[PDB]
């Protein structure tokens, strides 16, 4: 109360319900408040960023929760890392936090001028699975119900599927284009999937080895680390930032992340011990290669 | 400290047969003879516990505090 | 952590109720009591909640006692023991409960909170 | 006419006393020469002409969204005396007792545990030591007597006086979990032989789940403790209760729908621009069961829908269902009401078939 | 939480029983571990432990997996096949939230896990 110049606890207010104009109320943090999020050591300019608070009303949760794609700002992982969080309470510090220190300002690295954020891990491999031309089940198609279900969690305005029958089939490139059309960009680059070391073996699909986007329509190629990966200069999120703003890129990273995650929700992705196992014929081939290296070492000894 | 009342994973009540299983396993090991390498596949089946990876894992691996203390 | 845990008074010591022998044991477990559980684990992507070394856990597995246990803290103070009388007033701790005190101490079995006074 | 719920196999899990070691152990421990009063029963149900959303919703409800009973200790019921065992803490024993599966008609039963080890070695407390002092005397036991509640060191006691029957659902605490999953398959999708190296990395089904719409399902659920002489009645009651729980939740959502002419916090309607109306329904503490059912039946009722989808974010603890359709608010509400009526009819048919089949 | 291969992990999701994925036999995980946690750190001992423990649980045995003991992952996978499972430890699995099966068979099995005594209530 500024008339008394005194601070009063909320429990001791007998008839102080006259919260009069000019006095300062200290209220709880609500969803939508901005907070400074800091991981130490603070080495980068993005080691402190301002995030919009989402209050987790579950009393059993006591962790700071963040999107996995926001970890690139702090060089953080979830193996036990701790980060400091303070909510600006002053008006000047809150205006500053919103306008200046928001993490949309650190989407492009000051150090390298490239984008910092992008898809990581599941969203990188889930974007490839979504946008690949063929699956082991045949063509990489989904029906209208599953195409709609990919956009359930994007938190954006969902596209229109009214022109699709229930039995109509949609490609993963078609549903991706439904999202990228909101921020149309032009991209043409080879994917990380296509590489010359792998090329002599494996059948590379022609539709997969050249990623092309025209006005937000992905027409060929897969989306992987080259296009959607974090720190990929010239990727789709760097382009969205250049044309529409770093805040749009952050919203597009989240939306494409949801599409990739909702796709693997049906595709499934796993690793097995048999994934690392050579066939008995290939194990003999590897043994013969090493015997060649040992003989070459042995001849050097004889010299 | 004991075999759990239910399977930790699925909630099937393995503690219904925990005591019978412990005693019967001790006897069946004592006839056979590592001790842990003797197969309890048929012993667990007789108790009515199904071929569930989770239920048979927690049944045969849970440490009994009375055995160590 | 210590088979004499209830007799001992410990600080920051966690006693886990349930322990399992590993299904794939090693020679070390012949000499140290196995601590941990043979959890069923699926190596899979499930909604992106286990990324960057995170894990999705079964809530039922938590409720059923998996990795549950008791954490202990010791409060030792040295000298008289007794609940302060209202005559002290001024020197009393601000906002402290000062209740739940019998014979100068909190009774065994009482749930204490941040505002409570113990000993 | 067709029966949605087709044949069912009900097979209890029984102890095999043909095993010498099992018979000897049961005789030496509990003097048990026969089956326990309550046995786990594996129920394998076949469903035809029904969506996967309805069958999986039934499975989810029977797992952890059906009201269920468990034994809990009232505050102050764990008597701390000088002779209490120091290893059987209230937390450990309460966890043991909570997860004893009970089959209780009556909620007004209170049990007591009064165990004292006067002998020179460790005495194990069994579930038979839970003596009942409250309510009507149990003609049939509600739990098996073979559970190991704990063990007492020599000279130690354990008194637990207020062991009452608590009600709840399993998604709030797993002690209320009812059914465990033993099988789920679709009978109208062909399967590869997955022992082949070429197919061992795939699920087995010859249709991608992103395009398949299976209507013939096999659902196998195990119930942990039903009385041995009354297996079929218990299974019937479980299935009917699940169906009526689903119907009741759907009818709550039906009430929100019908009250649309008056503003409600849980239902928001817009007319966006192109004759499209956006309906957003938000129900707190609603799970994927109802959301999936609603999305599936709205989609089946409006195949040309602009968009239908739900999100159950693990935080915010709510179900948010968004319907966008090229129709007016009243016409959209009519279609949504008719889809809800379709859901209710499906589950009422399921309940009738449950009565018809198990009998 | 950590496994015996040193792969630490922070638990951030508690799903109910009905929300967890389950196999065609109803086996569901206690922990869901990202496959992306394997390839970089090369914790293949955890994979082999899961493979062996899948057959250990079905045979009702506990086996010695000490380091430098002879290892043949091909024979362990053949043992998995002999126990009635696939050559890999992968099973047909269904999404718990929707009931839809994953197109890929999911590698699921018993891996010994430990609770590291760093508690979030102590840290926060
Ligand atoms: Mg770290
Ligand atoms: Zn189990």
SS (H, E, C) chain A: CCCCCCCCCHHHCCCCCCCCCCCCCCCCCCCCCEEEEECCCCCCHHHEEEEECCCCCCCCCCCCCCCHHHHHHHCCCCCCCCCEEECCCCHHHHHHHHHCCEHHHHCECCCCCCECCCECCHHHHHHHHHHCCEECCEECEEEHHHHHHHCCCCCCCCCCCCCCCCCCEEEHHHHHHHHHCCCCCCEEECCCCCCCCCCCCCCCCCCCCCEEEECCEEEECCCCHHHHECCCCCCHHHHHHHHHCHHHHHHHHHHHHHHHHHHHHHHCCECCHHHHCCCHHHHHHHHHHHHHHHHHHHHHHHC
Question: Angle at CA A214, nearest 5°, toward A210 and A220?
Answer: 30
Length, in residues, of chain A: 303
Distance CA A128, CA A193 (A): 8
Please give the structure tokens belonging to residue D127.
């579930």
Distance CA D194, CA A271 (A): 17
Burial of E75 from C-beta contacts in 10 A (0-12 / 13-18 / 19+): exposed
Distance CA C42, CA D97 (A): 29
Beta bridge partners of A52: A34
Please give the structure tokens belonging to residue A140.
């990489």
Q: DSSP 3-state assignment of E107?
A: strand
Task: Report the separation in Å between the CA atom of E6 and the middle of ligand 1, taken as the mean of its atom positions.
Answer: 13
Distance CA D339, CA D215 (A): 18
Best of C63, C67, C71, C108 to disrupt the D interface (most D CBs within 10 Å) is C63
Distance CA E5, CA E8 (A): 9
Distance CA D78, CA D157 (A): 11
Residue A221 and residue A209 in contact, taking contact as beta carbons nearer than 8 Å: yes
Does E120 sit within 8 Å of A267, measured CB to CB? Answer: no
Judging contacts by C-beta atoms under 8 Å, the chain A residues touching residue E98 are 265
Cα separation values, D74 from A21, D1, D324, Å: 49, 52, 49
Distance CA A252, CA A246 (A): 10
Please give the structure tokens belonging to residue E32.
């869901």
Taking alpha carbons only, the member of A150, A160, A207, A213 closest to residue A184 is: A213
Distance CA A79, CA A100 (A): 30
Distance CA D24, CA D16 (A): 12
What interhelical angle do A122-131 and A246-267 show, nearest 10?
70
Helical (H) or strand (E) element with D56: helix D52-60
First CA to last CA across chain B, in angstroms?
A: 10
Taking alpha carbons only, the member of D167, D190, D208, D174 closest to residue D71 is: D167
Distance CA E75, CA E87 (A): 10
Q: DSSP 3-state assignment of D32?
A: coil
Please give the structure tokens belonging to residue E107.
């590698």
Distance CA E61, CA E79 (A): 13
Residue D43 and residue D8 in contact, taking contact as beta carbons nearer than 8 Å: yes
Cα separation values, C72 from C33, C69, D28, D246, E121, Å: 21, 10, 39, 44, 13
Burial of D186 from C-beta contacts in 10 A (0-12 / 13-18 / 19+): buried
Residue A76 and residue A82 in contact, taking contact as beta carbons nearer than 8 Å: no
Q: Strand D267-271 and strand D148-152: pairing?
A: unpaired
Tokens 């034994």 — which residue?
D71
Please give the structure tokens belonging to residue D159.
């008194």
Question: What DSSP letter does each residue of chain C carry, written as one string?
Answer: --TTTTTS--SSEEEES--B--SEE-GGGGTS---SEEEEEEEB--TT-STTTEEEEEHHHHHTTTT-EEEE---------SPPPTTTGGGSPTT----S-BTTBPPTT----TT----
Q: How far is CA A47 from its chain centroid?
A: 18
Residue A256 and residue E92 in contact, taking contact as beta carbons nearer than 8 Å: no
Distance CA B64, CA A248 (A): 58
Neighbours of D141 (CB within 10 A): 19
For residue E38, the distance in angstroms to the closest alpha carbon of chain B comes to: 23
Sign of the dihedral through C-alpha C34, C35, C40, C41:
negative
Helices of type H across chain B: 18-32, 41-46, 53-61, 65-68
At residue E107, what are phi and psi to the nearest 5 degrees?
A: -80, 110
Q: Strand E63-64 and strand C24-25: pairing?
A: parallel
Active site residue C85: no
Distance CA D342, CA D348 (A): 10
Nearest neighbour of A161 by CB, restricted to D201, D213, D307 = D307
At residue C30, what are phi and psi to the nearest 5 degrees?
A: -75, -10
Q: How far is CA D31 from its chain centroid?
A: 33
Neighbours of A184 (CB within 10 A): 16
Distance CA D356, CA E81 (A): 41
Distance CA C16, CA C31 (A): 19
Please give the structure tokens belonging to residue A217.
């329509």
Length, in residues, of chain C: 119
Residue B59 and residue B18 in contact, taking contact as beta carbons nearer than 8 Å: yes
At residue D292, what are phi and psi to the nearest 5 degrees?
A: -65, -40
Own/partner pairs for A48-51, CB < 8 Å, 24+ apart? A48/A101, A49/A73, A49/A74, A49/A101, A49/A102, A49/A103, A49/A106, A50/A97, A50/A98, A50/A101, A50/A102, A50/A103, A51/A103
Taking alpha carbons only, the member of A285, A255, A277, E20 closest to residue D64 is: E20
Distance CA A107, CA A114 (A): 8
Q: How many CB pairs under 8 A join B and D?
A: 110
Distance CA E56, CA E82 (A): 12
Distance CA B41, CA B56 (A): 9
Question: What DSSP letter does each residue of D228-282 carry, written as one string?
Answer: GGGHHHHHHHHHHHHHHHHHHHHHHHHHHHHTTTS-BTTEEEEE-SSS-EEEEEE
What chain C residue is nearest to E52 in terms of C-alpha separation?
A: C24
Residue A195 and residue A219 in contact, taking contact as beta carbons nearer than 8 Å: no
Distance CA D84, CA C108 (A): 13
At residue A28, what are phi and psi to the nearest 5 degrees?
A: -70, 160
Residue C68 and residue C18 in contact, taking contact as beta carbons nearer than 8 Å: yes
Burial of D290 from C-beta contacts in 10 A (0-12 / 13-18 / 19+): buried
Instruction: Tell me which method was used to determine the 3D structure.
Output: cryo-EM
What's E25's DSSP letter? T
Length, in residues, of chain D: 359
Residue C19 and residue C68 in contact, taking contact as beta carbons nearer than 8 Å: no
Distance CA D241, CA D351 (A): 9
At residue D82, what are phi and psi to the nearest 5 degrees?
A: -65, -30
Cα separation values, A231 from A69, A235, D279, Å: 11, 8, 39
Q: Strand C54-58 and strand E10-15: pairing?
A: parallel
Length, in residues, of chain E: 124
Neighbours of A167 (CB within 10 A): 10
Helical (H) or strand (E) element with E12: strand E10-15
Neighbours of A4 (CB within 10 A): 8
Cα separation values, E32 from A125, B7, C19, C48, D60, Å: 17, 18, 20, 10, 19
What's B9's DSSP letter? T
User: Near ion ligand 2, which residues have CB within 5 Å?
Assistant: B 7, 9-10, 12, 52, 54-55
Task: Report the separation in Å between the CA atom of E66 and the middle of ligand 2, taken as the mean of its atom positions.
Answer: 27
Please give the structure tokens belonging to residue C36.
């941990």
Distance CA A144, CA A130 (A): 15
Distance CA D255, CA D249 (A): 10
Distance CA D341, CA D249 (A): 13
Residue A24 and residue A89 in contact, taking contact as beta carbons nearer than 8 Å: no
Residue D2 and residue D49 in contact, taking contact as beta carbons nearer than 8 Å: yes
Q: DSSP 3-state assignment of D208?
A: coil
Beta bridge partners of D39: D226
Please give the structure tokens belonging to residue C3.
């088979």
First CA to last CA across chain C, in angstroms?
A: 28
Beta bridge partners of D38: D227
Taking alpha carbons only, the member of D77, D91, D97 closest to residue D147 is: D97
Partner A contacted by E122 (CB < 8 A): no
Judging contacts by C-beta atoms under 8 Å, the chain A residues touching residue D307 are 148, 151, 158-161
Q: Strand C37-43 and strand E31-33: pairing?
A: parallel
Q: Strand D318-325 and strand D68-73: pairing?
A: unpaired
CA gyration radius, chain C? 22
Beta bridge partners of C71: C14
What's B33's DSSP letter? -
Q: Say which residues have a Cβ less than 8 Å from residue A183's Cβ, sequence separation at least 6.
A: A216, A240, A243, A244, A248, A252
Judging contacts by C-beta atoms under 8 Å, the chain E residues touching residue C35 are 114
Give all strands (DSSP E) within chain D, no chain letters: 5-12, 38-47, 68-73, 78-79, 111-116, 123-126, 130-132, 148-152, 157-168, 180-186, 217-227, 267-271, 277-284, 307-311, 318-325
Taking alpha carbons only, the member of C73, C65, C63 closest to residue C19 is: C65
First CA to last CA across chain E, in angstroms?
A: 17
Residue A277 and residue E73 in contact, taking contact as beta carbons nearer than 8 Å: yes
Residues after which chain C has a gap (C–N > 2.5 Å): 79
First CA to last CA across chain A, in angstroms?
A: 94
Distance CA A131, CA A174 (A): 9
Please give the structure tokens belonging to residue A171.
């490609």
Please give the structure tokens belonging to residue D77.
């019921």
Does C51 sit within 8 Å of E36, measured CB to CB? Answer: yes
Please give the structure tokens belonging to residue A237.
């999120």
Please give the structure tokens belonging to residue C74.
């010791």
- Up-side HSE of residue A153: CA atoms within 13 Å toward CB? 21
- Up-side HSE of residue D41: CA atoms within 13 Å toward CB? 23
Judging contacts by C-beta atoms under 8 Å, the chain D residues touching residue A143 are 210-211, 213
Partner C contacted by E37 (CB < 8 A): yes
CA gyration radius, chain D? 25
Residue C98 and residue C117 in contact, taking contact as beta carbons nearer than 8 Å: yes
Does E15 sit within 8 Å of D203, measured CB to CB? Answer: no
Task: Report the separation in Å between the CA atom of E63 and the middle of ligand 1, taken as the mean of its atom positions.
Answer: 33
Neighbours of A243 (CB within 10 A): 12
Residue D96 and residue B1 in contact, taking contact as beta carbons nearer than 8 Å: no
Distance CA B40, CA A18 (A): 75
Distance CA E124, CA A60 (A): 13
Q: Which of C10, C53, C85, C103 is catalytic?
A: C53
């Amino acid at each position: 109360k500024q008339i008394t110049q005194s601070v009063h606890d909320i429990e001791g207010l007998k008839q102080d319900f006259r919260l009069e104009v000019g006095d300062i109320l200290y209220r709880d943090v609500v969803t939508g408040d901005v907070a400074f999020f800091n991981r130490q050591p603070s080495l980068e300019r993005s080691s402190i960023g301002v995030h919009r608070i989402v209050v987790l009303e579950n009393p059993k949760i006591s962790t700071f929760q963040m999107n996995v794609s926001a970890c690139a700002w702090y060089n953080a992982d979830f193996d036990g890392d701790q980060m400091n969080l303070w909510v600006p309470w002053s008006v000047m510090s809150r205006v500053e936090a919103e306008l200046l220190c928001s993490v949309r300002n650190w989407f492009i690295s000051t150090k390298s001028s490239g984008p910092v954020n992008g898809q990581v891990q599941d969203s990188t491999v889930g974007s490839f699975l979504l946008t690949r031309t063929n699956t082991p089940m045949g063509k990489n198609v989904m029906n209208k119900l599953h195409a709609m279900g990919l956009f359930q969690t994007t938190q954006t305005d969902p596209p229109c599927f009214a022109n699709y029958s229930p039995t109509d089939l949609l490609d993963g490139k078609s549903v991706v284009s439904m999202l990228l059309r909101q921020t149309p960009i032009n991209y043409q680059r080879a994917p990380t999937w296509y590489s010359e070391v792998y090329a002599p073996y494996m059948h590379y699909n022609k539709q997969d080895i050249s990623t092309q986007i025209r006005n937000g329509e992905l027409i060929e190629g897969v989306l992987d680390k080259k296009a959607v990966g974090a720190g990929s200069s010239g990727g789709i999120y760097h382009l969205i930032s250049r044309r529409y703003g770093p805040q749009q890129a952050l919203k597009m990273i989240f939306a494409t992340q949801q599409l990739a995650l909702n796709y693997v929700r049906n595709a499934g992705f796993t690793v097995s011990t048999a994934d690392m196992l050579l066939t008995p014929e290939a194990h003999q081939e590897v043994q013969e290669i090493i015997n060649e290296l040992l003989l070459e070492s042995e001849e050097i000894n004889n010299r | 400290m004991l075999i759990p009342v239910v399977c930790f994973t699925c909630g099937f009540p393995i503690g219904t047969y925990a005591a019978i299983f412990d005693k019967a396993r001790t006897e069946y090991i004592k006839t056979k003879m590592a001790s842990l390498q003797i197969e309890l596949k048929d012993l667990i089946t007789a108790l009515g516990i199904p071929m569930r990876v989770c239920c048979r894992t927690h049944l045969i691996t849970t440490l009994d505090y009375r055995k160590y203390y | 952590y210590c088979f004499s845990w209830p007799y001992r008074v410990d600080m920051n010591r966690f006693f886990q109720f349930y322990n399992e022998m590993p299904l794939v044991k090693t020679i070390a477990h012949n000499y140290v009591i196995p601590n941990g559980l043979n959890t069923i684990v699926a190596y899979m992507i499930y909604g992106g909640y286990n990324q960057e070394d995170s894990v999705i856990v079964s809530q039922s597995f938590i409720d059923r006692g998996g990795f549950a246990g008791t954490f202990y803290r010791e409060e030792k103070v040295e000298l008289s023991f007794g609940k302060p009388d209202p005559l002290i007033t001024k020197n009393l701790k601000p906002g402290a409960n000062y209740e739940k005190l019998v014979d100068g101490f909190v009774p065994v079995g009482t749930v204490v909170k941040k505002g409570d006074i113990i000993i | 006419m067709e029966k949605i719920f087709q044949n069912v196999e009900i097979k209890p899990f029984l102890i095999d006393f043909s095993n010498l070691f099992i018979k000897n152990a049961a005789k030496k421990l509990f003097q048990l020469e026969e089956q326990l009063p309550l046995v786990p029963v594996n129920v394998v149900m076949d469903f035809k002409g029904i969506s996967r959303a309805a069958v999986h919703g039934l499975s989810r409800v029977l797992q952890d969204e059906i009201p269920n009973y468990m034994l809990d200790i009232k505050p102050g019921g764990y008597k701390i005396e000088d002779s209490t065992d120091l290893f059987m803490t209230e937390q450990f024993i309460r966890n043991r007792i909570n997860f004893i599966p009970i089959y209780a008609k009556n909620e007004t039963l209170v049990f007591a545990l009064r165990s004292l080890n006067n002998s020179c070695e460790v005495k194990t407390i069994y579930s038979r030591d839970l003596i009942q002092v409250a309510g009507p005397k149990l003609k049939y036991p509600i739990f098996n007597p073979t559970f190991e509640i704990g063990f007492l060191q020599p000279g130690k006691s354990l008194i637990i006086e207020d062991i009452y029957i608590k009600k709840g659902i399993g998604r709030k605490h797993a002690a209320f979990n009812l059914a465990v999953k033993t099988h789920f398959s679709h009978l109208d999708i062909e399967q590869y032989p997955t022992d082949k190296k070429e197919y061992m990395a795939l699920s087995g089904y010859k249709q991608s789940s992103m395009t398949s719409d299976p209507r013939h399902h096999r659902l196998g659920l195990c119930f942990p403790a039903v009385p041995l002489p009354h297996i079929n009645q218990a299974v019937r009651t479980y299935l009917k209760n699940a169906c009526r729980i689903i119907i009741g939740r759907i009818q709550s959502i039906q009430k929100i729908y019908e009250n649309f002419e008056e503003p409600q916090p849980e239902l928001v309607l817009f007319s966006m621009d192109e004759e499209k109306t956006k309906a957003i329904i938000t129900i707190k503490d609603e799970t994927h069961t109802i959301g999936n059912l609603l999305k599936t039946y709205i989609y089946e009722m409006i195949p040309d829908i602009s968009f239908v989808g739900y999100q159950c974010v693990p935080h915010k603890q709510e179900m948010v269902l968004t319907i966008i359709h090229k129709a007016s608010q009243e016409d959209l509400i009519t279609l949504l009401e008719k889809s809800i009526q379709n859901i209710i009819q499906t589950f009422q048919i399921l309940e009738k078939n449950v009565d018809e089949l198990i009998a | 939480m950590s496994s015996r291969s040193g792969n630490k992990g922070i638990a951030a999701l508690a799903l109910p029983t009905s929300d967890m994925p389950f196999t065609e036999d109803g086996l569901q995980p206690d922990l869901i571990v990202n496959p992306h946690s394997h390839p970089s750190r090369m914790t293949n001992g955890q994979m082999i432990e899961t493979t062996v423990g899948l057959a250990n649980a079905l045979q009702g045995v506990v086996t010695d997996g000490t380091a430098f003991l002879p290892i043949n992952v091909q024979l362990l996978s053949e043992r998995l096949a002999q126990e009635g499972l696939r050559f890999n430890g992968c099973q047909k699995m269904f999404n718990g939230q929707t009931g839809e099966y994953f197109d890929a068979a999911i590698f699921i099995g018993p891996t010994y896990h430990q609770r590291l005594q760093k508690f979030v209530l102590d840290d926060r």
